[PDB]
């Protein structure tokens, strides 16, 4: 009766740097904001339910080293949406988004929709880190310029969070999820 | 209204303690009509079994026919509980005395089909695993039955705690949600106002006797691992020293918190408070082997979920099994090689050697089951996937290689 659950393959990708690991173990293990536990092994699933609609979704976590270039996008196929995720405090991670992440998206997966992530979002305002970039010359990225680079990649949605404070993390899952239904 | 079935709750202990029957029954359907507007199928249904253990298979509506209507009615509950097993141990109830104390047959074809049906629902129609979120009131502005104590409440169907704590912080607007799980101060305590904790905690298995040997399917094992529970644990991680930006998994220590409830859920209520809280702390050894083996028992139960049913999406199997056979992002065990198998750990701790020898196993037990479930995901794998399986076995057969020799084949 009902058939069974609608399986949603979600890819997330980015750099290293990003700090995109730390987003899926916290909303699949409904970890406490501040601790939850790393484990040896590289998925993770949720059975969730978003508009009513119950569904198992499977979070891919991609490798960012190039090394992967290969490798990586073998896994492209299938997939339901992409979450592309760069941090909010390195502006080199936000100029790959458009420079390797994008491209390599579209390249091998042309029609699947891609979700916009700024991560870190709780560093932007945090003295010591605004001084580092400073000190590099460069600056947090701003909401705008998330947007912006959102438009511009024609993602659907654009959407910021941070693991540690958790802040807008469910968001980034339910709209993901609002993207394949 | 919490606050009105708390009290419900507490008139209608009295009323057990002191006998007063008449106010007691009164207050047990005061009690069902609140669960009913709120949609609690399950607790208006044991609150019901509260009346029936006062009522006999007698003839003294007589009693036999009273609580009969009222099995009947709580199995109605159940039903839409989907505690299936619950239900069908109230039919065996009334199919003995069909049977043997007043040989209504008819009525008991009846019941052995409503029995036929939750066994076969049991198996087949899956069940969403519900949440468990433990609640700390620590404010000296808490009343006296909510003050500096702690709640378990069982999570409605797909209920996250985002959600529920939402709920709290509207119950309450002035108190202030804590930022550690971890056990308060007397400095909070004593304080004059509302602090909140909440986070999610893990059911345990209550050990059941019936299944305590047998082969039991993780399909009718799986529920009592989330139902029928009233110990739970919160596991939290923390680093103790000589930190390696290699693996951070040599390091990581975990503190470990029980909580023992009352009574067990679900049942009167979707809470029932803490009685009991103990720690326990888990070393990086000890966490790689609850991590090897719930990577085991996830393996082998999604292959057996694959070896019956065939009309199941493999995306969520190309997903385990690639994740466990390559996983290029976090470490893979060899992070525990690494960290526990240089022969200076050893030397420092002799007492491990039993559990060294445990964790090695593990691996070795690995690799039969990747293959097993590699096996499956060979015969039903889309073609626009070919190339991705092709990788994920020769990772495989480099892995079956590699582990084969340093451990024995298993």
Redesign the interface.
């Known amino acids: 009766?009902q058939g069974?659950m609608q399986?949603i393959?979600c890819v997330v990708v980015g750099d290293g740097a990003v700090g995109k690991?730390c987003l899926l173990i916290s909303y699949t293990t409904?970890?406490?904001?501040?601790?939850?536990?790393?484990?040896?092994?590289?998925?993770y699933?949720a059975?969730?339910?978003v508009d009513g609609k119950?569904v198992?979704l499977?979070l891919?976590?991609?490798?960012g080293?190039e090394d992967?270039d290969r490798?990586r996008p073998?896994?492209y196929?299938?997939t339901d949406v992409f979450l592309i995720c760069f941090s909010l405090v390195s502006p080199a991670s936000f100029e790959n988004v458009r420079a390797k992440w994008y491209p390599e998206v579209r390249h091998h997966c042309p029609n699947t929709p891609i979700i916009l992530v700024g991560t870190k979002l709780d560093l932007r305002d945090d003295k010591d880190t605004i001084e580092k970039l400073k000190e590099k010359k460069l600056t947090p990225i701003t909401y705008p310029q998330g947007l912006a680079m959102a438009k511009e990649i024609g993602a659907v949605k654009y959407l910021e969070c941070s693991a540690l404070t958790q802040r807008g993390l469910?968001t980034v899952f339910d709209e993901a999820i609002r993207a394949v239904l | 209204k919490d606050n009105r079935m708390s009290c419900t709750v507490n008139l209608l202990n009295f009323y057990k303690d002191n006998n007063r029957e008449e106010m007691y029954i009164r207050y047990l359907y005061k009690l069902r009509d609140l669960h009913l507007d709120c949609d609690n199928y399950t607790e208006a249904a044991y609150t019901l079994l509260l009346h029936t253990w006062l009522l006999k298979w007698s003839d003294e509506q007589t009693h036999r026919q009273l609580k009969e209507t009222l099995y009947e009615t709580i199995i109605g509950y159940f039903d839409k509980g989907k505690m299936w097993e619950e239900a069908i141990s109230l039919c065996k109830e009334l199919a003995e005395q069909y049977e043997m104390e007043i040989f209504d047959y008819e009525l008991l074809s009846q019941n052995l089909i409503q029995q036929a049906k939750f066994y076969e629902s049991i198996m087949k129609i899956l069940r969403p695993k519900p949440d468990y979120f433990a609640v700390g009131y620590y404010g000296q502005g808490f009343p006296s039955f909510l003050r500096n104590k702690v709640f378990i409440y069982r999570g409605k169907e797909y209920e996250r705690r985002e959600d529920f704590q939402m709920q709290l912080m509207t119950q309450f607007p002035n108190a202030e949600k804590m930022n550690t799980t971890s056990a308060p101060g007397d400095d909070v305590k004593n304080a004059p106002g509302q602090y909140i904790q909440c986070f999610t905690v893990q059911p345990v298995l209550d050990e059941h006797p019936r299944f305590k040997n047998k082969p039991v399917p993780d399909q009718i094992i799986n529920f009592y691992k989330s139902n029928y529970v009233q110990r739970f644990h919160y596991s939290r991680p923390v680093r103790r020293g000589t930190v390696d930006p290699e693996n951070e998994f040599a390091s990581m220590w975990i503190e470990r918190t029980s909580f023992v409830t009352a009574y067990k859920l679900p049942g009167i209520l979707r809470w029932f408070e803490v009685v009991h809280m103990s720690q326990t702390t888990i070393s990086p050894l000890e966490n790689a082997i609850e991590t090897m083996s719930t990577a085991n028992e996830k393996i082998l139960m999604m292959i057996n979920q694959y070896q019956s049913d065939e009309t199941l999406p493999i995306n969520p199997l190309s997903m385990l099994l690639n994740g466990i056979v390559d996983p290029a992002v976090m470490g893979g065990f060899a992070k525990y090689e690494k960290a526990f198998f240089t022969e200076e750990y050893v030397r420092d701790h002799p007492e491990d050697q039993d559990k060294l020898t445990h964790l090695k196993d593990l691996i070795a037990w690995q690799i039969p089951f990747l293959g097993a479930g590699i096996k499956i995901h060979e015969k039903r794998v889309s073609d626009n996937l070919r190339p991705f399986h092709d990788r994920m076995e020769e990772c495989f057969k480099n892995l079956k290689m590699k582990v084969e020799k340093e451990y024995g084949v298993r």
Do not use: H, R
């Open positions: 009766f069974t399986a393959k690991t409904n970890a406490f904001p501040g601790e939850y536990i790393p484990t040896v092994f590289d998925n699933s059975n969730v339910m119950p198992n499977g891919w976590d991609t490798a080293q992967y490798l073998l896994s196929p299938q469910k």
